Design a protein around this ligand. Sequence first.
Ligand code: HEM
Length: 278
Amino acid sequence: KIKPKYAREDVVASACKQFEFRPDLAATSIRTAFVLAARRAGFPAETVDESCAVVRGLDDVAGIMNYLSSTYPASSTEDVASLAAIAGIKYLNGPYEAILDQWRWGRNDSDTAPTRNIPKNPNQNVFSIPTILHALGGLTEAECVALLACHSVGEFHENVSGLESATHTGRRYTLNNRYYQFLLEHERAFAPLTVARTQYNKEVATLPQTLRCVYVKAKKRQCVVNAAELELLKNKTWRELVVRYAADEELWREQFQSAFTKMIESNFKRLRPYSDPN
Ligand code: HEM
C-alpha cells in the first residue's frame, strides 16, 4: 500500500510552526535525529566527550514530538521524529530539499532493548568520531564530515555538556558550511576548557574533559568544540574534506543531504518509497 495517511510536508509545516515560537528547539530536533540513529547503532552516549548522542536535554523536543504524534496519529513516532528533524533543517535555512523529496516512510516503532557497543580496548571508554559516524548507515568519509556542519547551529546546555552560553561557531540559526570555515580559521587558537561543577550542571554526572575553547569577537562569544573534532583536522583525508567544504558550499550541500538521509534511514528495515496520499 503506497499509502501514507498524511502528506510529509504537512508534518514538516506543523513542526516549523512550533519552531516559530521555540526557535531553539529546531537545532535540538536535528540533534535528536543523531541521538536516535546513534542509539539504533549501539552508540548511546553518556558523555559529550564522546558525542551529543546523550539522552539528556530532550524534554522540550519530546514535547513537540508528542504534539506532532497527536496531530498525526496513524503515523509511526519514528517517521514523525525524522520529519521534525528535517523541519529543523528547513527552519534553520539548511539544505533539506533532497532529504525531504527522497524521504521514505514506514519506520517501525519497535520496542528494542537499548544496546551499547563495547570498545576493543578494555581501558577505552569512548568511541572515535569516525567509528560512530560511519556506522550511521554506512557513511563514506565525505558524508561523515558533511554531517558535522549541524554544529553550525544550536548551542550548549547545562544539563547536556554542563555549560551554557556557548556555541560551536559563534552562531546558532543558519545551517551551512560555516562550521568548516570556523574550524580552519581558529584551529591553532583553541585552548583546553575546564567545565566546573556548578549548581546548574548536576545532571552531568561526569563533566567533559576534552572540550576546547576559543573566544571570538565588540564583545566576545565563547566557542566550544570537542578535542576529537579538532584532532581530525590533523588527519589528511578528513582535513581535505573540511578544506573542500569550506570553499565549496554546493558540494557540501550534496554530501550533507546524502549523509542525513542515510542516518535517518539507518537500522530501519523495509522502508517504503513515498507516494502522495492524495
Ligand atoms: C560524533 C561526534 C559528535 C560530537 C563530539 C558532538 C558534540 C556536541 C556537543 C558537545 C554539543 C553541545 C550539546 C549541548 O550541550 O547541548 C552538540 C550539539 C549539537 N549537535 Fe553534536 N556532536 C557530534 C555529532 C553530531 C551529529 C552527527 C549531529 C547531526 C547529525 C550533531 C548535531 C548537533 C546539533 C544540531 C547540536 C545543537 C543541539 C541543540 O542546540 O540543542 N552532532 N554536539
